[PDB]
Amino acid sequence: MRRGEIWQVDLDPARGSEANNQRPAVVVSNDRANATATRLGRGVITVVPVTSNIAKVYPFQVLLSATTGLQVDCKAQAEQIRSIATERLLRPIGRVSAAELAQLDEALKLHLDL
Amino acid sequence: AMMRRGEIWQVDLDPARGSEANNQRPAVVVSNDRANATATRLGRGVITVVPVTSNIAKVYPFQVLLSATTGLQVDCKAQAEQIRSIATERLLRPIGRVSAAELAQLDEALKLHLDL
RNA sequence: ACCU
Fold first, then answer.
1. What is the DSSP letter of A92?
2. How near does any CA of chain A get to the CA of B89, in Å?
3. What EC number(s) does the entry state (chain A)?
């Protein structure tokens, strides 16, 4: 997996307002860590869960447009950031645009006070 | 009980799969204090933490050595690569607080891990 | 999904 790619991930079981079920997520961990996790068969990668509920788009969230990829308009929730074992990766879906990824970088900086 | 950035809490990470950090262990709050304040006020929602381990054999650039001289009983390292948002109900107990210097390091460790 |  690579940073910017959209993957179907298994987030269950989730507690409280943690994003649940099997849903798309954007890889945001750097590619050196991603490359290290793949071949070794261990380690974690970091992803940003995605939701179809787009009634509100907070500044720490990024609107993703449906393309081949996501079938409906969605928003990436940087506040839902989560490091997961690679075995949670189910399906490759596609990748966000460079514009969407650049926005996600800013959303992550904002959320993590970086 | 307000959780603040830089503070250390006993968090419940179970159940975990694969190489995911597990069990009930210390973690450093790294989400901004606006989100944090909102989370306590509403009694729900997610805040973001960085898990901590006592296995300090090697400290990677995306990891930060935390001195016991923290609330932590022994020397530990914060694993920015294990960062995850958690529901407030996973917050069990406040433990302590990292120094301003250690937190700055953690910010740098977060930037490196997340390519920011 | 829900909450922000």
1. E
2. 7
3. 3.1.-.-
Q: Check if the beta carbon of residue B49 is closer than 8 Å to that of residue B9.
A: yes
Residue type at B56 in one-letter notation: I
Could you give the number of structural domains in chain A? 1
The shortest CB-CB distance from B115 to any of A16, A30, A84 is to A30
d(CA A86, CA B112): 20
**Solved with:** X-ray
Containing domain of residue A69, as a range?
Answer: 1-114
**Distance (Å) of CA B64 to CA A16, A71, A85, B81:** 29, 40, 21, 11
Q: Is A41 on the interface with B (CB under 8 A)?
A: no
- Chain-centroid distance of CA A80 in Å reads 9
Round to whole Å and give the CA distance between B37 and B26.
Answer: 20
Q: Which tokens go with B115?
A: 């390519």
Return left, alpha or beta for B54; rule: phi > 0 is left, psi -120 to 50 is alpha, else beta.
Answer: alpha
Q: What DSSP assignment string belongs to B67-110?
A: ------SS-EEEEGGG-EEEEGGGEEEEEEE--HHHHHHHHHHH
